[PDB]
C-alpha cells in the first residue's frame, strides 16, 4: 500500500491519502536548482532543508481525515545559488476507509495465521436450517429469510470519514475473486445479497462524511481438496474524477476469513443427546438404552420403524460433530453416502435450527460397508512425539494395501476429512472384518488419572488366558451361551480344545496387534493407555472376522456409564465371567457396566450396542483456530 | 437387515 | 515400525525380525513365578536377571539376515523362590527388506522435506517423446519403449536378504494408494509395467537369498489443485505360511516422491534459442532476430507460413520453462490454450526428444488475451523482507477487480502456477491495456550492478520530460514518425499541446505507477532497481491503452544484446532522440542495443519485437528442492 | 491477423 507523488512546478497535483498508508513524494523527476524546502500544514507530518538528490526519502503522514477537498497541503520549494525560490504546490485530501472484521477472533497483516498469536477472523458454513417450515439449508438461496440466521453470519464493517462531497468524484467497490465467489454470500445490513455465486463485485452506496456499514458474510462450501479454506474479500476505492478516462484504483484493502471445519467428538466428550432407532421389533434394547441415556443426563431421540424402513444401525448413516466460531457454536451431521433405510433421518430430523447438515460421496451407488460411520471414529486430545492434536485425531478402517477384493472409504471422504486439518486423520486396518468397521475392535473410555482415557481393544488373548483359567479352576464344563434358547451351547473345554477357533482367533489377534501398534505410533501411547477386553472371533464368508459371541467393545459410551453388549458367557459362581473380567476392568477407573441384552436383535444381524446407536457430545472448549496443524 | 452390506 | 512379540510357555513362538525395526518382547502377559532371565543366540543383542513386572523394557535386535529360517532363537526362563525354572522359547528369522531411492537427492523418515537440509525423492513428469517417429509424450502408455526414455525416469531398488526358502511363506506386494495410482507408473527391470493406472498392487516375485530388484517410476501428473505433488510407493512383507487363513501383513516400507514443478526462466538467465514465426509478409526484421540470435550464440527456429497460418505471435501460443530431477533436467513447453494459427507449433515441431509439453485450460473456446503468454513472464532471483524467491516470481496481469467487462487469464492457469509453487505468482494490472499483457508496459535485463538486473517499465513521464527538453532546445518542429512514408508525421510542439492526449497518458501513468509500487512490494525493488523507458501510449477502443510509437519495452533480451522495437523518434543532430535517450539508459550497464523496424509488420497490428518472438533460456543453477516455499 | 483477439 505505497504510494508515490510526483510534485512538479509547471503545476499543482491533487492527490487522496487514506490514512494508515504510506505516501512519499518524487521531488526530483521534474524539479527545475541544487536544494529544497518544504513547508506543510499543520495537519500533515513531513518526515525526512535539504540538497536535490533522488535518495533522498520525504514521506508524508497525515493524522486525521480531511473535512474538504485539498484541505492540507505542501508547498516544496526548490531554490538555489542565484535562483529565487520555485514552488510546487500538493493539495491533499485525507480519508479513512477501514474495512473490519473479528481477526482477533473475540467480537468486532492481511495474511490469516493459526494459533494462539495469530490472527483472521472465522467465517461458518450456513448449513443448517432456521427457517421455519422449509426444506432447504439456509445457504442454499440469496436471502436472509429469518433474523437468527444472521448470528450465522460473521459480520464485517466499512467504516468511511470523508469530506461531505468525497463520492461525487470517487466509488468504493466491495469484491472477491471469481474463484472464490461460489463459496461465500455477503449481504448489505440496513439484509440484500451484495456479492455471492452470481456477483463477485457490487458498487457501494455511500455517503461523505462520517458513516458505517454493516455486512454479514456466509460461507457456503467447506474446506476441501478444491478449497483451502480462505476466503478474501476486498473494497477497493476507484477514482471517478474524469467522465471520459476508465476509473482508476487509488487504494485496496481487505479482510480473509477462513472457514470453519467439520470437527468430531470422541467418547470422553460429556453427551447431550443420544440416538437410536430401536422402534422396530424390540423394545427391551431400547429400555436399557433409554436408562442409560437418563443416567446419562442426555436427551433422547428415536427414529420409529415407519421412518427407519427397518434399518436398525443408526451408528452407520450419521456422525454429529460441530463447527465453531468466536460468534457461534453448532452440532452439524455429516450424513454417510450408504443411504440404507435411515437415509433421510439426517436431513428430515437431525438438521434444523442451530444443527448444520455436511455429505460427501456418491448418493445412487459405487460405495461400500467402509463409509459407514461405524467406522469413523477419533481420538481423545493427545501429544505425540511433542506434537499436540488437542481435538484428537479421526480413526477411519482401511485394508493394509489395494486388492481387486479390498474395500476402502470413498476417497470422497477420506479427502473431506484430511481437508479440516484439526484431526489429521489416521487410516487403521479394519477390513479383516466382515462388516468392516473400526468400532468393532476399539473404543475408547474417560478415565480419571493417566491421560483421561484408556484405549478399549478387542482380545482374543485375554478370553483365551480367562477361559484357560475358569478351566483350571475347575469349571471346564462351563456353557458359553447359556441363557440363550435358541443356540448350542458350548462348553469351555471344547473351545480351549478346537485348533481352528484358536488358528482364526490367532489370525485376528494379529491383526488387532497391527493397529495396536499402529495406534501407539500415531497417538503416542504407552501399554498403560490400553486395555484389553476379553473376545472372541470367527472367520467365515471370504475368510472375514465376525464376533463369537456379542462384541463387548462395540459399547456405548455416556461418561461414566457404559453400555456393553450382554456376552452371555459361561456362568460361575453366580455370574457371567466375561461380564466379571470386564467389570475388573473397568470399575477400577469409575466406570459403570450396563450389560445390555442384543442377541437376536443386533449381535445375530452383524453389530452390537454402538452399531445401534449414536451420540451427540459436547464440544471441545479448545478453540481449533488456536491449533497449528 | 444387516449391518454388512 | 514396532512390533510386540507375545512370548508363552505353553509353546514356542516363531517370528520374523526385519532389520532395522523395533521388536519388544511381552514376557509377562502368559508368564506362570516372580522372575525371569533371558538368553539368546549371539546374533540376538537383547537390551533391558529381572523381576516379571509389566512395565521392564525387552527389545530384541538382530545383527544381520538369517542363513535359515529360525536360525537365532530367545529362550526366556521363568523362576520363582521354590519353583525350577520355567522356560519359553522364540524362534526368529532376520531378514533384510530395503526399498531404496535417492532420497538424499545425488544418486541411488517417510516423509519429503524441502530445503539443503531435507530429504524425499524426486520425480519427473514423462511428457516428453523420445519414441521416433510418434505423436504421443512417452507417459501416455505403459510401456517403455526406447532405452533413452530411462533417462527421465526415477530408479527406485528393492534390496532383500533372506534365507533361501523364505518366498515359500512369504510375499512382497508392491503398492500405491488409488488416489495416487492415476499419477504414477512403475516398470520393473531385468522392463515391464508393475504399477500405475489400472493396477495399484503387484506380487513380486523374488528368490530367497541376497537379491536387487530395480524399477523406474514416471510421474504422469504435474502438481496442480487436485494434486499436491507427492506420491507414495510402498512395500508390503505378507506372511502367506497358512493355507487356511487370509495373508498376514508383518512388514511394511515407504519412498515417497515428489514431483518436480514447471519452472519458467526470466530474461536474465542466458538464451539458448530463439524462436520467430516470421515467415509470413516480411524478412527484414527476420533478418535482425537472426543477426541477435548469432550475436547471443542461440539455435534459431523459425515457423513458416504454411504452419503459422499467417499468426506471427511467437511470444503468445507458448513458454519455454523446464523440470529438473538430480538425474535428469530437460526443458518443457507449456502450450497457452490461446489455440490460434500457431497451435501446433508446440506439439508438431517444440515437443520433442527432451523437450517436454504441457498444457491447460479449455482448449476449444472459453477463453481471453490474458490466456496469451505475451501476459506471463518471470522476475530474476529475489528476496523480499527476508524471504528468499532463489528461482524468481511470476508474473501475469490480471483486472483491478472483478467485472462485466474486465478480462483474467483463465483460473485453471492461474491454478497450475500456483501449485508448482516454487515461483510463488503475482497478479499484476494489465487489463487496462488493449491487448492486455504484462510485456507492454515491463521488461527485466541483466546488469552487471546492484541485484544483477534492472526493471524496465514504459513510461509516459520520461517521454513528456524528453520532448519538453528538445523543444527547450529549438526543435519543437521536430516531426515524430520520420522514415516512415505512410504515415501522418507530428511535431513534439503538437504533441505537447495536445491535451486529450496527455490527459490519456496520464491516466495510463497511474497504471503503470500502481504496477511499479505492487513489484516494488513483490519483489523488493528500491527505485535503483527500476529505469523507466520513454513511452507514449493512446486510449482507443473501450477506452483501453495501445502504444502511441513502438513500444521500446516490448522488446527481445538476448542477454547483453537488445532487440528494440524501432520507434521512429524526433531526428534531433541526425539520431532519432528516443534512440539516444534509451542508449544513454541502457548503454551504461554494459547493454547493446539494436533498433528494428517492426513498424508495419508488427506494431500496426498490436505487438513488437517481444511479442514477434520467444526464447528459451538456461535453467537456473539453483535446485529447486532446495527451496523452502 | 493482430496480437488482441
Ligand atoms: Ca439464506
Ligand atoms: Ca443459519
Ligand atoms: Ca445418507
Ligand atoms: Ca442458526
Ligand atoms: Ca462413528
Ligand atoms: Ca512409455
Ligand atoms: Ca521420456
Ligand atoms: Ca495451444
Ligand atoms: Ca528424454
Ligand atoms: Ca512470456
Given at each position: 500500500?505505497?504510494?508515490?507523488?510526483?510534485?512538479?512546478?509547471?503545476?499543482?497535483?491533487?492527490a487522496?491519502?487514506?490514512?494508515?498508508?504510506?505516501?512519499?513524494?518524487?521531488?526530483?523527476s521534474?524539479?527545475?536548482?541544487?536544494?529544497?524546502?518544504?513547508?506543510?500544514?499543520?495537519?500533515?507530518?513531513?518526515?525526512?532543508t535539504?540538497?536535490?538528490?533522488?535518495?533522498?526519502?520525504?514521506?508524508?503522514?497525515?493524522?486525521?481525515?480531511?473535512?474538504?477537498?485539498?484541505?492540507?497541503?505542501?508547498?516544496i520549494?526548490?531554490?538555489?545559488?542565484?535562483?529565487?525560490?520555485?514552488?510546487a504546490?500538493?493539495y491533499?485530501?485525507?480519508?479513512?476507509?477501514?474495512?473490519?472484521?473479528?481477526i482477533?477472533?473475540?467480537?468486532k497483516?492481511?495474511t490469516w495465521?493459526?494459533?494462539?498469536?495469530?490472527?483472521?477472523?472465522?467465517?461458518?458454513?450456513?448449513?443448517?436450517?432456521?427457517?421455519?417450515?422449509?426444506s432447504?439449508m439456509?445457504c442454499?438461496?440469496?436471502?436472509?429469510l429469518?433474523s437468527?440466521?444472521?448470528?450465522?453470519?460473521?459480520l464485517?464493517?466499512?467504516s468511511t470519514?470523508?469530506?461531505?462531497?468525497?463520492?461525487?468524484?470517487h466509488?468504493?467497490?466491495?469484491?472477491?475473486?471469481?474463484?472464490?465467489?461460489?463459496?461465500?454470500?455477503?449481504?448489505?445490513?440496513?439484509c440484500?445479497?451484495?456479492?455471492?455465486?452470481?456477483?463477485?463485485s457490487?458498487?457501494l452506496?455511500?455517503?461523505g462524511?462520517?458513516?458505517?456499514?454493516?455486512?454479514?458474510?456466509?460461507?457456503?462450501?467447506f474446506?476441501?481438496?478444491?478449497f483451502?479454506?480462505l476466503?478474501?474479500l476486498?473494497?477497493?476505492?476507484?477514482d471517478?474524477?474524469?467522465?471520459?478516462?476508465?476509473?482508476?484504483?487509488?487504494?485496496?484493502?481487505?479482510?480473509?476469513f477462513?472457514?470453519?471445519?467439520?470437527?468430531?467428538?470422541?467418547?470422553?466428550?460429556?453427551?447431550?443427546?443420544?440416538?437410536?432407532?430401536?422402534?422396530?421389533?424390540?423394545?427391551?434394547?431400547?429400555?436399557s438404552?433409554?436408562?442409560?441415556?437418563?443416567?446419562?443426563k442426555?436427551?433422547?431421540?428415536?427414529?420409529?420403524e415407519?421412518?427407519?424402513?427397518?434399518?436398525?444401525?443408526?451408528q452407520?448413516?450419521?456422525?454429529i460433530?460441530?463447527?465453531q466460531?468466536?460468534?457461534?457454536?453448532?452440532?452439524?451431521?455429516?450424513?454417510?453416502?450408504?443411504?440404507?433405510?435411515?437415509?433421510?433421518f439426517?436431513?428430515?430430523?437431525?438438521?434444523?435450527?442451530?444443527?448444520?447438515?455436511?455429505?460427501?460421496?456418491?448418493?445412487?451407488?459405487?460405495?461400500?460397508?467402509?463409509?459407514?460411520?461405524?467406522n469413523?471414529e477419533?481420538?481423545?486430545?493427545?501429544?505425540?512425539?511433542g506434537?499436540?492434536?488437542?481435538?484428537?485425531?479421526?480413526?477411519?478402517?482401511?485394508?493394509?494395501?489395494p486388492?481387486?477384493?479390498?474395500?476402502?472409504?470413498?476417497?470422497?471422504?477420506?479427502?473431506?476429512?484430511?481437508?479440516?486439518?484439526?484431526?489429521?486423520?489416521?487410516?487403521?486396518?479394519?477390513?479383516?472384518?466382515?462388516?468392516?468397521?473400526?468400532?468393532?475392535?476399539?473404543?475408547?473410555?474417560?478415565?480419571?488419572?493417566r491421560?483421561?482415557?484408556?484405549?478399549?481393544?478387542?482380545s482374543?488373548?485375554?478370553?483365551?488366558?480367562?477361559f484357560?483359567?475358569?478351566?483350571?479352576?475347575?469349571?471346564?464344563?462351563?456353557?458359553?451361551?447359556?441363557?440363550?434358547?435358541?443356540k448350542?451351547?458350548?462348553?469351555?473345554?471344547?473351545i480351549?480344545?478346537?485348533?481352528?477357533?484358536?488358528?482364526?482367533?490367532?489370525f485376528?489377534?494379529?491383526?488387532?496387534?497391527?493397529?495396536?501398534?499402529?495406534?501407539?505410533?500415531?497417538?503416542?501411547?504407552?501399554?498403560?493407555?490400553?486395555?484389553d477386553?476379553?473376545?472372541?472371533?470367527?472367520?467365515?464368508?471370504?475368510?472375514?472376522?465376525e464376533?463369537?459371541?456379542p462384541?463387548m467393545?462395540?459399547?456405548?459410551?455416556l461418561?461414566?456409564?457404559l453400555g456393553?453388549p450382554?456376552?452371555?458367557?459361561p456362568?460361575?459362581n453366580?455370574?457371567?465371567?466375561?461380564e466379571?473380567?470386564?467389570?475388573?476392568?473397568?470399575?477400577?477407573?469409575?466406570?459403570?457396566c450396563?450389560?445390555?441384552?442384543?442377541?437376536?436383535?443386533?449381535?445375530?444381524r452383524?453389530?452390537?450396542?454402538?452399531?445401534?446407536?449414536?451420540?451427540?457430545?459436547?464440544?471441545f472448549?479448545?478453540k481449533?483456530?488456536?491449533?497449528?496443524? | 437387515?444387516?449391518?454388512?452390506?
Amino acid at each position: 500500500q505505497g504510494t508515490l507523488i510526483r510534485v512538479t512546478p509547471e503545476q499543482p497535483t491533487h492527490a487522496v491519502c487514506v490514512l494508515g498508508t504510506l505516501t512519499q513524494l518524487d521531488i526530483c523527476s521534474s524539479a527545475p536548482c541544487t536544494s529544497f524546502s518544504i513547508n506543510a500544514s499543520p495537519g500533515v507530518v513531513v518526515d525526512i532543508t535539504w540538497p536535490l538528490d533522488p535518495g533522498v526519502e520525504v514521506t508524508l503522514t497525515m493524522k486525521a481525515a480531511s473535512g474538504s477537498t485539498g484541505d492540507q497541503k505542501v508547498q516544496i520549494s526548490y531554490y538555489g545559488p542565484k535562483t529565487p525560490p520555485v514552488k510546487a504546490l500538493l493539495y491533499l485530501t485525507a480519508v479513512e476507509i477501514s474495512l473490519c472484521a473479528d481477526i482477533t477472533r473475540t467480537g468486532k497483516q492481511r495474511t490469516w495465521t493459526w494459533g494462539p498469536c495469530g490472527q483472521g477472523a472465522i467465517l461458518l458454513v450456513n448449513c443448517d436450517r432456521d427457517n421455519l417450515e422449509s426444506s432447504a439449508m439456509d445457504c442454499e438461496d440469496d436471502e436472509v429469510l429469518d433474523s437468527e440466521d444472521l448470528q450465522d453470519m460473521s459480520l464485517m464493517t466499512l467504516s468511511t470519514k470523508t469530506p461531505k462531497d468525497f463520492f461525487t468524484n470517487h466509488t468504493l467497490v466491495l469484491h472477491v475473486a471469481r474463484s472464490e465467489m461460489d463459496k461465500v454470500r455477503v449481504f448489505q445490513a440496513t439484509c440484500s445479497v451484495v456479492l455471492g455465486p452470481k456477483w463477485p463485485s457490487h458498487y457501494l452506496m455511500v455517503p461523505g462524511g462520517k458513516h458505517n456499514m454493516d455486512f454479514y458474510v456466509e460461507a457456503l462450501a467447506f474446506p476441501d481438496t478444491d478449497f483451502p479454506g480462505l476466503i478474501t474479500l476486498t473494497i477497493s476505492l476507484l477514482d471517478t474524477s474524469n467522465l471520459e478516462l476508465p476509473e482508476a484504483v487509488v487504494f485496496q484493502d481487505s479482510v480473509v476469513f477462513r472457514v470453519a471445519p467439520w470437527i468430531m467428538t470422541p467418547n470422553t466428550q460429556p453427551p447431550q443427546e443420544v440416538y437410536a432407532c430401536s422402534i422396530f421389533e424390540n423394545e427391551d434394547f431400547l429400555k436399557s438404552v433409554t436408562t442409560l441415556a437418563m443416567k446419562a443426563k442426555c436427551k433422547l431421540t428415536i427414529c420409529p420403524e415407519e421412518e427407519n424402513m427397518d434399518d436398525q444401525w443408526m451408528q452407520d448413516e450419521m456422525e454429529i460433530g460441530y463447527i465453531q466460531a468466536p460468534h457461534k457454536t453448532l452440532p452439524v451431521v455429516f450424513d454417510s453416502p450408504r443411504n440404507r433405510g435411515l437415509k433421510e433421518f439426517p436431513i428430515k430430523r437431525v438438521m434444523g435450527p442451530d444443527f448444520g447438515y455436511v455429505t460427501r460421496g456418491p448418493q445412487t451407488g459405487g460405495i461400500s460397508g467402509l463409509d459407514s460411520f461405524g467406522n469413523l471414529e477419533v481420538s481423545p486430545p493427545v501429544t505425540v512425539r511433542g506434537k499436540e492434536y488437542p481435538l484428537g485425531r479421526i480413526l477411519f478402517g482401511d485394508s493394509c494395501y489395494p486388492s481387486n477384493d479390498s474395500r476402502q472409504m470413498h476417497q470422497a471422504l477420506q479427502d473431506f476429512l484430511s481437508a479440516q486439518q484439526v484431526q489429521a486423520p489416521v487410516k487403521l486396518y479394519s477390513d479383516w472384518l466382515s462388516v468392516g468397521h473400526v468400532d468393532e475392535f476399539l473404543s475408547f473410555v474417560p478415565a480419571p488419572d493417566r491421560k483421561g482415557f484408556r484405549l478399549l481393544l478387542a482380545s482374543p488373548r485375554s478370553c483365551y488366558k480367562l477361559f484357560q483359567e475358569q478351566q483350571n479352576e475347575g469349571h471346564g464344563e462351563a456353557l458359553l451361551f447359556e441363557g440363550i434358547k435358541k443356540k448350542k451351547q458350548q462348553k469351555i473345554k471344547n473351545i480351549l480344545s478346537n485348533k481352528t477357533l484358536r488358528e482364526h482367533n490367532s489370525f485376528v489377534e494379529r491383526c488387532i496387534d497391527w493397529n495396536r501398534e499402529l495406534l501407539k505410533r500415531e497417538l503416542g501411547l504407552a501399554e498403560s493407555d490400553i486395555i484389553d477386553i476379553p473376545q472372541l472371533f470367527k472367520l467365515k464368508e471370504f475368510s472375514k472376522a465376525e464376533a463369537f459371541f456379542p462384541n463387548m467393545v462395540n459399547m456405548l459410551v455416556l461418561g461414566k456409564h457404559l453400555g456393553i453388549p450382554k456376552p452371555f458367557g459361561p456362568v460361575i459362581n453366580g455370574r457371567c465371567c466375561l461380564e466379571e473380567k470386564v467389570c475388573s476392568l473397568l470399575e477400577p477407573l469409575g466406570l459403570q457396566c450396563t450389560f445390555i441384552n442384543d442377541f437376536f436383535t443386533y449381535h445375530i444381524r452383524h453389530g452390537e450396542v454402538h452399531a445401534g446407536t449414536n451420540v451427540r457430545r459436547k464440544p471441545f472448549s479448545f478453540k481449533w483456530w488456536n491449533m497449528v496443524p | 437387515t444387516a449391518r454388512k452390506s
